[PDB]
Symmetry: D2
Subunit: 381 residues, 4 copies
Amino acid sequence: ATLPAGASQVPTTPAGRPMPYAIRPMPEDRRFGYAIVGLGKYALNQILPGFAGCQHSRIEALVSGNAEKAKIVAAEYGVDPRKIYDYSNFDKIAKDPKIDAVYIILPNSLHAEFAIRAFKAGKHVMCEKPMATSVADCQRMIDAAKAANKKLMIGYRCHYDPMNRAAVKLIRENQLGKLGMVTTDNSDVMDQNDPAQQWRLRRELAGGGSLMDIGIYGLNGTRYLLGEEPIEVRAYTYSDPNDERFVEVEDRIIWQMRFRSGALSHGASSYSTTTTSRFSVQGDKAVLLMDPATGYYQNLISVQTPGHANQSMMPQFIMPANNQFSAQLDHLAEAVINNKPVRSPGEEGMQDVRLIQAIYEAARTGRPVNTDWGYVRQGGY
Amino acid sequence: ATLPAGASQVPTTPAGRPMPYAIRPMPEDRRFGYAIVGLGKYALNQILPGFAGCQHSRIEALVSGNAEKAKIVAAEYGVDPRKIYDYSNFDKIAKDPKIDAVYIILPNSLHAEFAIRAFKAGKHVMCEKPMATSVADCQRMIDAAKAANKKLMIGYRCHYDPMNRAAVKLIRENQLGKLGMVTTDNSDVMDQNDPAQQWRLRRELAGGGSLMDIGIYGLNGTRYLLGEEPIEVRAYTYSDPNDERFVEVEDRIIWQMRFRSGALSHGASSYSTTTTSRFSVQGDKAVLLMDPATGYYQNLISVQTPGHANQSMMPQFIMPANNQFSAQLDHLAEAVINNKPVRSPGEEGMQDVRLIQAIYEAARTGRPVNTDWGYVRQGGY
Amino acid sequence: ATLPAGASQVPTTPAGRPMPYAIRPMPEDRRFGYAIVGLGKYALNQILPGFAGCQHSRIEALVSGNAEKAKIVAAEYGVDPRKIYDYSNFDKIAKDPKIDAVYIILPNSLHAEFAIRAFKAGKHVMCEKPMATSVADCQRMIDAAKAANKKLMIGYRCHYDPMNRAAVKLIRENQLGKLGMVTTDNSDVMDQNDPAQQWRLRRELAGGGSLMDIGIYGLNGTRYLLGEEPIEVRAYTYSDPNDERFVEVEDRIIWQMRFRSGALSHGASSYSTTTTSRFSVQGDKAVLLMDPATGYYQNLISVQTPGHANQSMMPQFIMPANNQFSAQLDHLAEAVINNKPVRSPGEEGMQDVRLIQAIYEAARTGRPVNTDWGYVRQGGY
Amino acid sequence: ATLPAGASQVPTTPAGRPMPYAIRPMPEDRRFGYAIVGLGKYALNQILPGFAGCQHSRIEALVSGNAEKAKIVAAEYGVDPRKIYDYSNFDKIAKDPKIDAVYIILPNSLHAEFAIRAFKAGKHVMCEKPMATSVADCQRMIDAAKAANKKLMIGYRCHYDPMNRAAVKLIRENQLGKLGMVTTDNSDVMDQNDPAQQWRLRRELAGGGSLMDIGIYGLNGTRYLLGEEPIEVRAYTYSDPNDERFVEVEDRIIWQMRFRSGALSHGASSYSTTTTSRFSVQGDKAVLLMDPATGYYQNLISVQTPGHANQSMMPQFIMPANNQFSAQLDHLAEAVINNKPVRSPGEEGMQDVRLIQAIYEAARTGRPVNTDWGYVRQGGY
Ligand SMILES: NC(=O)C1=CN([C@@H]2O[C@H](COP(=O)(O)OP(=O)(O)OC[C@H]3O[C@@H](n4cnc5c(N)ncnc54)[C@H](OP(=O)(O)O)[C@@H]3O)[C@@H](O)[C@H]2O)C=CC1
Ligand SMILES: NC(=O)C1=CN([C@@H]2O[C@H](COP(=O)(O)OP(=O)(O)OC[C@H]3O[C@@H](n4cnc5c(N)ncnc54)[C@H](OP(=O)(O)O)[C@@H]3O)[C@@H](O)[C@H]2O)C=CC1
Ligand SMILES: NC(=O)C1=CN([C@@H]2O[C@H](COP(=O)(O)OP(=O)(O)OC[C@H]3O[C@@H](n4cnc5c(N)ncnc54)[C@H](OP(=O)(O)O)[C@@H]3O)[C@@H](O)[C@H]2O)C=CC1
Ligand SMILES: NC(=O)C1=CN([C@@H]2O[C@H](COP(=O)(O)OP(=O)(O)OC[C@H]3O[C@@H](n4cnc5c(N)ncnc54)[C@H](OP(=O)(O)O)[C@@H]3O)[C@@H](O)[C@H]2O)C=CC1
């Protein structure tokens, strides 16, 4: 019969209006300053551009060995040219109060070194996965972390991905019933021509093949989906002996595991087949299928029962949660500010590494490896 | 047998490396400076945050009537507080050489006014849709544009959306064969409680109901999907007489059209049903289904034939094209820099408006309205 | 831990076992005897082969005008060669008690007449859609049903299709909220060289084009999905004047309808675009998409909301309900054997015909056509 | 513009018409006569009701150990009550020429014996999977086939399922590129109260658990999809020791296989998780996902690449190929009536059994089991 107050009170002339409804994460502040170490493929394609959607994180400095490149990136992101560090004067960041943390995005064999040096420089540390190329090196990073009394977070973006958390949540609500079989596959074609992949073929730098690089998603995903650690693993690996790509690191590798709850799992990673990111979780009441499972974008999950397939994915007009990249960056920022622990701590990064070494060991011996060493997930999966 | 050169040459020590492969649009420069007019729902939720992924555009100034708010946004996006203009001193932007264009994101009834004023201020103009609330006002904007010798672009984000362009491309390659029936639906529940929706219920400000606000997507989409203009339209509209939301503007409205090629179409817009963005294009060889069709995210298209459904959507790890928002902003920027016309010019915005007036007219009279007035799409759909 | 009684109680030797569990419709008897009139495309492609799955129906006799054909068919389905009638002695069926009802699968113009004739033969009538090419003929068929005091059921299989039934159930359960917009489309490329399609091009035999043949699905559907009749309708039709196929019947026609509840709808049918059968029901809580909406097999429905897509389809190992065809058949059988009214009475087929003539009028006159004539769905949609 | 000759040449009166077009498999004859042994769950839920769709097959007689049951069934399918055999006089079938072959649908332990007996009865043998619970028994059944000089075909329906056939065709067409990883999963919650499931819990009648019953699909599938046999295999099995269901047979077992081409695979089967039938074939050009992969109905395949999902399924109005069941039946009929070898010879069912025993060994011993024994798929996968 008549227009409601609100509409009726809108000026017909240009007038100031209120703060709008927010349908997506709005920026807030830029108090937590990062220093990015290693201007590479994942840094320039996903992380740097991922800062824009942060509500607390910003880029303060760059650390690269390619002067020409740092220069370009610096200008591309408004970073002060004076904040460009090379791998030598890296430790000087300790004199810059505006640098709260570093984000190590270097090849695997170098993580430990810069994590420690960063800590000695009195800075917090975000380090990419795989954590390091040895269990011992993982522990040394943890040690150094405790010594500097600083946080240590591993770059597990899936622990901050809406769809993944959505998946973890439905499992915890028992929509799948008792869990019994988890399947995983993570693959992408290895191109030795790509600069980023060249060190991944070097065992000394990569620390391993497809399992260290992408298999780790199925392994880690298997763990937070089930909400527990495996007690024993078995594995077999094969690589074409004529393929120049796999002279030092493994191409394809399969590994099955048993958990203390009785569930089993069988996953695989591959460097010779096209894009695959698919997780399957069989319960006795329903089956969860994630595909895409660990993508940078477009994740899709579906719960299946005879005659049904209830799918879930990000919405078309609203963005209920922040994207994994921005969420991850803000996560360490928030943990520092609120004096709280991170959900993806060094211990978590180390658990995957020990786990992988066990899988490689079971692959080499052809025998099962007991992994019932009592790792406990602080905070929950 | 052995590792390829590239891998073999990677230092085992921290060393500068090359520029990485780019799997997504990388930033480049920030030469084109915008001045945003109207810090509202669409501005703070989609546009402002959409600048980050631009390769040439940046935010130079803000124009708002809410001092407190502009202040906050300014700080949120690094805009110099001195570049905050209110609706009164708006014309002063003419003294700032660093402001190449304005982006009008005000309610419909105010577009014309600020587009013109912007032009008199010697600035280029990006104006949201619907263009204006009258055909005449559309023409006045065009006139003013020609007078200042500046570009006039209407905010048709779908004209820069990967999946939509992908859809336009498959139709042009005749994968659907001869086109005969196009169906569209665009709806979302109107909430008078939301500040952004309050002026949309006012005819004087909105210029109309669901057709002016969201029906325009089906209308415009119908046009670039077919690649031609309609020669006649028919329409009927209904709104619950007791619903306070629709006292001045229409809730639901249906309109069917005929094109010079023989194709027909039947679409609708709605303010009382939940989220719907679905386009259907029937050819005699195949059928295209877009759903989501015009979302901010997650668009999905599928070509269907008996026993088949070939779907397309953005990839999980690579981003072949830039997102509509960033693409749109950079589009006007590029057109200025390269002295080229925009794909979404004022004439295009005016064509939709005339078209809508015709539909409203056919709804009021209950008679068909001839729209065979020879509008020609400069550049292609 | 020891095996259950039942397991350990099984003979490791050839022994008899109980009646296995039924995971799909089980055959029972063949009490009902059908006489199928007109051995055409539908009759031989879907209907006859659909008796096999019936639970209370059998093919007792045939009625063909091509004896040679009827002999070959009679063989394939093992019907008594002595029971092969013709359109002349069709009435003699009244002498066989083994023939309880007849199934008229003849052109729309020959529907009414063979229904009335069959009613005097004291038999039950299963008549294909559309009921007839005249509202009056529809009425006479009814009158001839009351007189002979037999059952009159129209071939609306969608009224017996699991998924279509699932669609109505969720809507009735208010899963979509307040219904406000329905969109339907039905299409398939008209092949004049097809013997079956040749009488559809003739308006005297078909009684209409596109709408009378497949648009009726959208029209009927909209009605049981919404669960209410239109009170007003508008429509437009167009056909290429140079296409020899639509010299007498409409190729494409679009119709808009308004309902008492306030809900609106817009649907269409086409003879010149490839396979399309899609229903869309928009509520304020969720949107339902049936696609395929009305196929012989493979129907699919989905309930959409931002971020979710809950799809339903026939299971992959079980079969909770029988196929629409066998279900339509036995439905008449059970209707009589229980003195229960049929879900698709002749009064239901009549409403569609009145509504279609009303639409053709709206299209022909170009004005609204009040269809508020107090029809009532006896038994519910 | 005038209607085509055919259209205007149709009588507006009851007249005969030609044979309609066939949009689905048409019945022809019933030359072949089957004798179905063991009236169980599969026999009555899928097989018998699948003869209706056959083109060259008929149910000539039954073989039951529960006369009462066999009388009721014989009725439903109209079989001659005088042709209801028993496991004692089963051999007398050799006296009826109307019985060309028998279909053994008995527990795995009673497969071989009734096959050899039937061969002496000079009849063709259709034997369900697994062939037998012993490689030797498999061999004897074969020998008894050569002797009697009759056909020996195993019930591999997937070898006759449209979609499964579509899967092989696209792979053979190199749409996925170089095959490198296959992932299979088959599962369904074991119900001990089900008469049919009670002999599966008994390892003497079943000859194995999870793998022998459904894992065989993954195993078989992997083989025809890849189109080559494994040369080596590894596996692990685990079952809850407190579950009375898996006291004698395995609940969940996982197996990894390597192929000559270099391709690898990892698949699993489960008795304690709900419905799962998913195949995954990874190549370097695309990935194929079958899901449902091997159902009775509703199979679905998709070919994936970044940004694309090309799905295939049975059309919604047509039926290009007959259902796996009727197709499996007639396939034996046609095999004889043309002196052509069957696609699923006994030599094919034997390979699966040798491979399964090899797997059980690998799981039991925990070591690799060379399966490189020169088998060859006579006739192709
Ligand atoms: N979580 C995720 O989704 C992903 C995580 N990652 C992780 O990020 C880290 C970096 O990998 P990515 O960006 O893909 O690879 P890149 O090869 O592209 O970059 C590695 C960067 O580290 C620096 N660097 C220093 N010494 C060396 C060296 N000797 N060899 C190679 N690089 C060196 C270089 O920086 P500069 O040139 O500027 O001196 C280089 O740009 C890895 O640990 C990887 O596991 C990678 C992809 C995805
Ligand atoms: N292309 C797309 O996808 C979309 C386009 N739009 C378009 O953007 C434009 C803005 O709409 P939207 O952001 O949703 O709406 P809002 O109501 O949220 O904002 C309108 C803005 O304009 C200014 N304004 C000045 N005078 C008035 C007035 N009298 N009444 C209301 N606002 C006034 C205000 O800015 P300040 O307070 O700072 O002074 C206000 O924030 C519209 O023309 C709309 O069609 C909207 C959504 C999507
Ligand atoms: N509900 C559904 O899904 C469907 C319903 N139908 C309906 O079934 C009915 C039959 O159509 P359909 O089977 O497709 O078409 P056909 O042309 O293939 O068959 C028509 C049948 O009617 C008989 N007939 C008698 N006189 C004529 C005549 N003058 N011209 C043509 N046929 C004649 C013929 O029998 P004989 O040759 O033996 O002499 C012929 O078999 C229609 O009412 C149609 O709407 C059709 C498809 C689907
Ligand atoms: N390929 C496929 O998709 C499928 C294949 N199968 C196969 O079919 C075969 C039969 O299994 P299924 O029908 O599911 O099982 P059931 O338990 O339901 O039936 C077994 C049948 O064998 C006869 N039988 C004779 N001796 C015994 C005995 N000692 N214990 C149990 N039954 C006996 C019975 O006949 P009667 O009662 O009349 O005396 C009974 O009907 C198996 O080889 C199975 O693997 C099963 C499902 C699917």
